[PDB]
C-alpha cells in the first residue's frame, strides 16, 4: 500500500546546506603570550629548568599568537598540582572541569548563533556537538539540549575525542543532515577546553611542550540548513562538496591518548611538511571539477595548527600573503582552539568582508575552501560558496 518512493521524495530537502548564523564564545581569562613563558614555568614549578624555559620562550615567540582565553586560571592550577605536573593521575579532576565547561561555553556560543538566526529554537531539528575535551554519558549534546531548552526530540550527533580536524567533520556531517531532510535546521557546536591537555614541561617530551605554547579555549556555533526562507533567513556561506583523507607517510604524526593523567599528545613526523606536501592533491580533487586551478582566486580558511603549517602552505602554493589574513587573525587573538578554530575563521572572514564593504562574505570572491587538519594525519576539505553582500 504505502509508497516509499513518495515518502522519500517528500522527506528530503532541495538546495545546498547553508550556514545561516555563526556565534562564538571564550572563557573570560585572557592570557597574554608575551608573559606566558614566565607564568607557565612558575605555575608548574619548573623555574630550575633553564634550558627548557628558553626553548619554550622561543616556541612562544614564534607562535604568532598574541593572546589566548583559558578556563584554567592561576587559582584553579594552584588547587590542582597533579594537573601542573607533566604526568600525574588527574583525569578525574580534568573531567570534572570539562564535563561542565564544554557545554557551558558551547551554550554561550549557541545563544549568540540562535539570536543572529532569529528563528524559534523549537525549529532546531538536529544538534551536532563536537569536543576533544572530556567525555561523559549522557554527553555534552544532552547537556546542551537541556541548557538551551531545545526540543527533547532534537536528533543528536555527539562527536567526542575527535581532534583538530573536526571543524571540517562537523560541516561535512551537517551538510548531509540538512540536505537530506526537508525543513531540517542543524545547530552545530564545537567547544574546546585545554584543561584536559594542560600539563607541566618535560625536556624529553618537547612535542607535548609545543602544544602548551599553542592551545587555547573557545567555542563556536552555527545554524545550518537547506532551503533558507528568503529574507527571513540570511545565508552566509553555502557548502557544495566535502572530502576527508589520510595523508600517506603520516603514521603517528599526531597521536593523542586519553589516560589517567589526561590527554597527552605525541608528535612523530613533520606536520607542516605533510600538510604542505598533500594540500595540492586535496585542492585538485575539490576544484578540478569546478574548473578552477588558481588558488589565489578562492577564499581560504585553514586550521592554524601552528604558524609553520600556514607558512609552508603559503610558500608551497604561492598564496598571496593576504589569503591567510583571517586565519592568522584568529590564531593571533585566540591561539589554536582545536575543532572550533575553523568556525571562528569563518566568522572573522564574513565580519571583515561585510564591515569593509566587499561584495561577498568570502572576501569579495565566489568560491572558497576550508581545511581541517589533525590526527591520522587527517585532512578535511569543505568547498564553500560565498553569498552576495
Interface with ligand MLC by CB under 6 A: which residues?
A: 55, 58-59, 62-63, 206-207, 210-211, 214, 254, 256, 265, 267, 271-272, 305-309
Cα-Cα end-to-end distance for the chain: 49
Question: Which of 43, 59 has the CB closer to ligand MLC?
Answer: 59
Question: Which of 182, 316 has the CB closer to ligand MLC?
Answer: 316
DSSP letter (8 states) at residue 323 = G
What distance in Å separates the CA atoms of residue 216 and residue 324, rounded to the nearest whole number?
19
Minimum distance, C-beta of residue 35 to ligand MLC, in the bound complex (Å): 17
> Is residue 111 within a helix (H) or strand (E), and if so which, with residue range?
helix 91-117
Phi, psi of 142 (to 5 degrees): -65, -45
Give the burial class of 250: count Cβ atoms within 10 A of its Cβ; 0-12 exposed, 13-18 middle, 19 or more buried.
Answer: buried
- Span 106-135, contacts to a second copy by CB under 8 A: 132, 134-135
Query: How many angstroms separate the Cα of 258 from the Cα of each of 11, 32, 100, 161, 183?
Result: 40, 28, 18, 9, 38
Q: Which three cell numbers stand for residue 285?
A: 580533487
Residue 344 within binding range of a second copy, rule CB under 8 A = no
Question: Which of 37, 375 has the CB closer to a second copy?
Answer: 375
Q: Are 368 and 300 in contact (CB under 8 A)?
A: yes
- Span 173-202, contacts to a second copy by CB under 8 A: 173, 175-177, 179-181
Applying CB under 8 A, which of residues 41, 56, 142, 237 lies at the interface with a second copy?
142
Of 68, 75, 95, 94, which is closest to residue 83 (Cα–Cα)?
94
Question: Which of 190, 239 has the CB closer to ligand MLC?
Answer: 190
What distance in Å separates the CA atoms of residue 103 and residue 136, rounded to the nearest whole number?
11
Q: Which three cell numbers stand for residue 198?
A: 594542560
371 binds, among a second copy, ligand MLC, none (CB under 5 to 8 A by kind): none
What distance in Å separates the CA atoms of residue 267 and residue 178, rounded to the nearest whole number?
36
Residue 323 within binding range of a second copy, rule CB under 8 A = no
Residue 86 within binding range of a second copy, rule CB under 8 A = no
Question: Which of 87, 267 has the CB closer to ligand MLC?
Answer: 267
Minimum distance, C-beta of residue 164 to a second copy, in the bound complex (Å): 9
175 binds, among ligand MLC, a second copy, none (CB under 5 to 8 A by kind): a second copy
Minimum distance, C-beta of residue 334 to a second copy, in the bound complex (Å): 21
- Span 87-106, contacts to a second copy by CB under 8 A: 89-92, 95, 99
2 binds, among a second copy, ligand MLC, none (CB under 5 to 8 A by kind): a second copy
Question: Which of 208, 353 has the CB closer to ligand MLC?
Answer: 208
Minimum distance, C-beta of residue 384 to ligand MLC, in the bound complex (Å): 23
Cell 567526542, located at residue: 160
Q: Within its chain, how far is the Cα of 254 from the centroid? A: 16
Residue 246 within binding range of a second copy, rule CB under 8 A = yes
Amino acid at each position: 500500500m504505502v509508497s516509499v518512493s513518495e515518502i522519500r521524495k517528500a522527506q528530503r530537502a532541495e538546495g545546498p546546506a547553508t550556514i545561516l548564523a555563526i556565534g562564538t564564545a571564550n572563557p573570560a581569562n585572557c592570557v597574554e603570550q608575551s608573559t606566558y613563558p614566565d607564568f607557565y614555568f612558575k605555575i608548574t614549578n619548573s623555574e630550575h629548568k633553564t634550558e627548557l624555559k628558553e626553548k619554550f620562550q622561543r616556541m612562544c615567540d614564534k607562535s604568532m599568537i598574541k593572546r589566548r582565553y583559558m578556563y584554567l586560571t592561576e587559582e584553579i592550577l594552584k588547587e590542582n598540582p597533579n594537573v601542573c605536573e607533566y604526568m600525574a593521575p588527574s583525569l578525574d579532576a580534568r573531567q570534572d572541569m570539562v564535563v561542565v565547561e564544554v557545554p557551558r561555553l558551547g551554550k554561550e556560543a549557541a545563544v549568540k548563533a540562535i539570536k543572529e538566526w532569529g528563528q524559534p529554537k523549537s525549529k532546531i531539528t538536529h544538534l551536532i556537538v563536537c569536543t576533544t575535551s572530556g567525555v561523559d554519558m549522557p554527553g555534552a549534546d544532552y547537556q546542551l539540549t537541556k541548557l538551551l531548552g531545545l526540543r527533547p526530540y532534537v536528533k543528536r550527533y555527539m562527536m567526542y575525542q575527535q581532534g583538530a580536524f573536526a571543524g571540517g567533520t562537523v560541516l561535512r556531517l551537517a551538510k548531509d543532515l540538512a540536505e537530506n531532510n526537508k525543513g531540517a535546521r542543524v545547530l552545530v557546536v564545537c567547544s574546546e577546553v585545554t584543561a584536559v591537555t594542560f600539563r607541566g614541561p618535560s625536556d624529553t617530551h618537547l612535542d607535548s611542550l609545543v602544544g602548551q605554547a599553542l592551545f587555547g579555549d573557545g567555542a563556536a556555533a552555527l545554524i545550518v540548513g537547506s532551503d533558507p526562507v528568503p529574507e527571513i533567513e540570511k545565508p552566509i556561506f553555502e557548502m557544495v562538496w566535502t572530502a576527508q583523507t589520510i595523508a600517506p607517510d603520516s603514521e603517528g604524526a599526531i597521536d593523542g591518548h586519553l589516560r589517567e593523567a589526561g590527554l597527552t599528545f605525541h608528535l612523530l613526523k613533520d606536520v607542516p611538511g605533510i600538510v604542505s606536501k598533500n594540500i595540492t592533491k586535496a585542492l585538485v580533487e575539490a576544484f578540478e571539477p569546478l574548473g578552477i586551478s588558481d588558488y589565489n582566486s578562492i577564499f581560504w580558511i585553514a586550521h592554524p595548527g601552528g604558524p609553520a603549517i600556514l607558512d609552508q602552505v603559503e610558500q608551497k602554493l604561492a598564496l598571496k600573503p593576504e589569503k591567510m589574513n583571517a586565519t592568522r587573525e584568529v590564531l593571533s587573538e585566540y591561539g589554536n582552539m582545536s575543532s572550533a578554530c575553523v568556525l571562528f575563521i569563518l566568522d572573522e572572514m564574513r565580519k571583515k568582508s561585510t564591515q569593509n564593504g566587499l561584495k561577498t562574505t568570502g572576501e569579495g570572491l565566489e568560491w572558497g575552501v576550508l581545511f581541517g587538519f589533525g590526527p591520522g594525519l587527517t585532512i578535511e576539505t569543505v568547498v564553500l560558496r560565498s553569498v552576495a553582500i
